[PDB]
Amino acid sequence: GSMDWYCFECHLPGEVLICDLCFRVYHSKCLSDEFRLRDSSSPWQCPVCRSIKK
Ligand SMILES: [Zn+2]
Ligand SMILES: [Zn+2]
């Protein structure tokens, strides 16, 4: 998941990424491009959900 807005003070967009399995909210700018990439087919897994055992 995600939410995006446009800040009228700096005239740049902002985004948070929301894990589809644990619902944690990441600054999109805190994540590398590999861990931001989403496909229109499967849920976005955050760094913890991607990395944790079973
Ligand atoms: Zn701003
Ligand atoms: Zn997660």
Domain assignment of residue 36, given as a range: 2-51
The span from the CA of 14 to the CA of 22, in Å, is 21
Which-ligand-closest: CA of 6? 1
SS3 (DSSP) at 23: coil
Q: Is the dihedral of CA 42, 35, 51, 17 positive or negative?
A: negative
The experimental technique used to determine this model is X-ray
Which-ligand-closest: CA of 17? 2
Please tell me the distance between residue 14's alpha carbon and the centre of ligand 1 in angstroms: 8
Q: For residue 41, what are the CA distances in angstroms to 27, 32, 44?
A: 23, 21, 10
CATH of the domain at 45: 3.30.40
Q: How many structural domains does the chain have?
A: 1
Q: For residue 11, what are the CA distances in angstroms to 5, 6, 8?
A: 10, 7, 5
Please tell me the distance between residue 15's alpha carbon and the centre of ligand 2 in angstroms: 17
Please tell me the distance between residue 39's alpha carbon and the centre of ligand 2 in angstroms: 16
* CB-based contact 21:43 (threshold 8 Å): yes
